[PDB]
Every structure is written in structure tokens, then in C-alpha cells.
Amino acid sequence: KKTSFGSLKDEDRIFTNLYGRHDWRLKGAQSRGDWYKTKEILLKGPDWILGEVKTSGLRGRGGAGFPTGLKWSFMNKPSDGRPKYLVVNADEGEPGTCKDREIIRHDPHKLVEGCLVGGRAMGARAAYIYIRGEFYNEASNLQVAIREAYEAGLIGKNACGSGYDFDVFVVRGAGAYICGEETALIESIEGKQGKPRLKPPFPADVGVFGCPTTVANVETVAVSPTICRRGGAWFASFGRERNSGTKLFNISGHVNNPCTVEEEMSVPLKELIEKHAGGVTGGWDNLLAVIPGGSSTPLIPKSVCETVLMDFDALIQAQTGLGTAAVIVMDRSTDIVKAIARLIEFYKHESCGQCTPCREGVDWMNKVMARFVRGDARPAEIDSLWEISKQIEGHTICALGDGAAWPVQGLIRHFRPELEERMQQFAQQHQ
């Protein structure tokens, strides 16, 4: 067992064209190991592929972190007449998250091969890659790559000479963050408003077009071929137990070199920021708070960031979450209340409006936060806002409602003196 994690070697990185300095097209992809022995992987069978993903300990990289091997095994059942589909979530809408964008445009063939291998394990006839409409150039890059795979016989009829037919369609979104939610993504593909479905049924039983479906994040799908080639045991050698593998991180905000970088799971938060992002603007002592996994995760203050690790279990114990592993850094010159208030404004603009607690509650929370920014409120409203957030959390159809409540809870948990100070200043200036 390892005590410490990080310092991932280049030989062990999966996304080796992360920065687009090598040819992203098929020839460059093959020279880097993509599409190698895909036929042999396919001829191993869905159970062997699903075993490798289970052994790798891989968990969903879209934000929720479900164990990928178990989730994909819901599809490993006899057909009943309906087709079966893999839906790749390339909506990438969480603020702070831009990792999936670099996979699609610089390593498109990893994603295409992942669809074939991942789709084979589920017995899917095709993959629908849902990419946010704003990613037009990335969508075109992916479409060029898919045409190359088709022309080379790597997908389509008799993919990789394996006797398995598989198509890969790209469908673009039209501007909605809620379409990253797995059931709302399915609804969007079907030509409706992106409004999430209740569960049950679950997608593996009733999904896109009403057929058995699996929705998977781009990063989850793109690492599957490598896991099969190099083995699950290789992947599980990275990170803590139940926190396996490498991870793409986005470090943005008040850092010297905001960047995307691949790094081992369970790396300390401080080492990640200082080693790869060039440190906090103005020095580590200038740090105020970090949102560790995209806007939906509660912020943690500087004291927590001193020692916390970046994996699913460590961040849960710190009262937050890994999320998409989008690290947003705020230095001490930040107006923390405004920064969080802007995130609630984001959720207010993205709420699909379907269900009452988020249609009405998020808009309500948005109004209170705007007053809290100016201090035009009473301290008794802080506890009220906490209770409103708890009335949204766990009572909505989808997790966007949970995602709007958690950032508010993070602000109140760690920066209540700041909120009260703003109110006290306003009362004097307006006495």
C-alpha cells in the first residue's frame, strides 16, 4: 500500500495528447496506441470487458462517481426485441469543468474506441454522443475522427473485423446545462425539452427512444479501451482503495497558470495546485477558499485545503465532493459572497423549471443571496436560507436542485461571520 499519491509519470498517463501538440487524427492516434488490438478486446466478450472495468475500480467521471463496472453491467442482460444504446455525455456544462472538451478535440479517437469497446460490453448497437451545441469546432473534430474510423473499418459494419456492427452518431445540444443530467440528456435526444425523468424506470430498462440505455461521461468512456489493454489491475494501482485511477483536473480561478492536467487520484489538493497550476495567486497564504469539484460542490476554506486529498472519499469526509474535479481557486481579494451568489444565479438560469422545489426555491435562494451580497438583510435570514436549501435538497426530480443548495450550504457553513459582517455594515450605513 502507498501512503502518498501523485507525481504520475508520463508513461502512465492515459490522455497523452491532452494539449494537442501531437496529431489528433487517426494516424497520430494509432502511433500513440489507440485502436491497438481492439479486435481481440471485442472477441473477449462483454463479460470479460465488464470484469476489467470492475477490477479497475473505475468510477463515473461525470460528477456522481458511481462504480462504472456495476453500472455498465445493468445492460448485460438478454435482449427482448428492443435495440440497446450507449449515450456518451459530452455536454460538459458544470462551471469550472472543461476536461471533456480537451478529450473530444485532441484525443477524439480515444472516445470513439471507447464507444465501441464500451458499447460492446453493454451489447449496444450504436452510441449517441451528445455534445453541447457551443462546442461546434470540437463536434466537427469528432465528426472527422468518426469518419476516419468508418473509412478504416474500425466501426460500422463488422467493426475491427470482429463481426460486431456498431455506429457512432454525434448529436449536438442547443444550450442547456440541465441536458448534462442523464435522463434530461435522453429527453433532449428525443426532441423534447431537456427535462429530467423520474426514476424508476431506470435508463438500463427504459432509456433513449424507450430502449435500454447507458449514459456515460466522456472521460469514463475514453479510458475504457486503455483499461482493457493494460488491465484493470494497472488502473487500480493508482489512488486509494475505492478511489482508483488517474483523473483529469481543471484548475482555474486565482492561480498563476490555470490549466488542465492529468494526475493520480488522491493527490493532495495543495500539491496539485502548486505543482501543476503554479501556486495560488499571491502565494498559498493568500488562499481563501476552493471549490474542489465544480460549482455544485460546497467550497472548503483554506484550513481544510491544507491537507485534503482529491478523491471521492476524502472530499466527502471534508463535507464536499470530488464532482468533476474542477478546482476553482479564490484568493483573499475575492468577494466570497458575490462569487457564490453568481453560482446561484447560474443555477437559476439553468433550472429546467419542471419541479416545484427547484423552479421556485432556486429563484428564491437567488433573491436572498443578492440581498446578502449587499448586506440588505437580517442575521435571522441566514438560518432561514439554510432551511430553504434543505427543503430543496432531496425533494427534487434531479440533482440540479441538490447542486444549487450545496454551494449555499458551503458558504453558510464556513463564512457565516462574513455574511453577518456584511449585514452589520449595511445597517449602520443605512441607519
Partner: protein, 87 residues
């Protein structure tokens, strides 16, 4: 949608003339039972009460909504008309 007003049996009497009061236009009546409504646990209790008081009566059997088969999943059927075009 509340069903709490459909639990008990009622006994009411036939409606009779109401006319306009010449002075004010108020609704006048000469029917002393115009407002009488009695409540019973069962129709047997209601019938027994009516019989001993000499009233002729009509009994209407209780209408109970039949059990419906509901399935949220049917809203997304692959090949059935139950698929909904909007949510």
C-alpha cells in the same frame, strides 16, 4: 381532488318551489324540509331511518372510483401510443 366528502351517506328531500320576495327579491320558500340533510354511516341505517318515519325513498348505490393501472415508464414507450410528446 379531495375525497373526504364522499365517505358518508346522506338523506335529502325533493326540491320544491323558491320564489322572489316582492320587497327585496330574496328567495322565499314554503318548504320546511328545504334545508334538511341527514348523515348516516351506511345505507342500511339511512333506509331504516326513512322507513320508520314514513318517507318514500330512492337509494342510489355508492359509486367508487375503480382501481387504475398507472405506470410512469409508459410515458416513454418504445412502440406504444402511450409515449408522451411533452413533459
Amino acid at each position: 381532488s379531495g375525497v373526504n366528502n364522499t365517505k358518508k351517506w346522506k338523506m335529502e328531500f325533493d326540491t320544491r318551489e323558491r320564489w322572489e320576495n316582492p320587497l327585496m327579491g330574496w328567495a322565499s320558500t314554503a318548504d320546511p324540509l328545504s334545508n334538511l340533510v341527514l348523515t348516516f354511516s351506511t345505507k342500511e341505517d339511512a333506509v331504516a331511518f326513512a322507513e320508520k318515519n314514513g318517507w318514500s325513498y330512492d337509494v342510489e348505490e355508492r359509486k367508487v372510483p375503480k382501481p387504475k393501472s398507472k405506470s410512469y415508464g409508459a410515458n416513454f414507450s418504445w412502440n406504444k401510443r402511450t409515449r408522451v410528446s411533452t413533459k
